[PDB]
Design a protein around this ligand. Structure first.
Ligand code: CA
Ligand code: CA
Length: 68
């Protein structure tokens, strides 16, 4: 399945990837956990496949449940 549709549902502003503000906002959207930019930034490099400082849908699967 193309995770592109998930990319489109996670995309808030149209950069096609989650940014620090977006990740935090989509997170806190209903569930609010940790908000320390260090930890959140650590997540960005962990979640992403390329660790390019952003969390995309495909990247989500890499880190989350699937192989990326
Ligand atoms: Ca964005
Ligand atoms: Ca990436």
């Amino acid at each position: 399945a193309e995770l592109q549709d998930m990319i489109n549902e996670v995309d808030a502003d149209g950069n096609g990837t989650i940014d620090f503000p977006e990740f935090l906002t989509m997170m806190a959207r209903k569930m609010k956990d940790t908000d320390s930019e260090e930890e959140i930034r650590e997540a960005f490099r962990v979640f992403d496949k390329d660790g390019n400082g952003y969390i995309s849908a495909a990247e989500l699967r890499h880190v989350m449940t699937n192989l990326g």
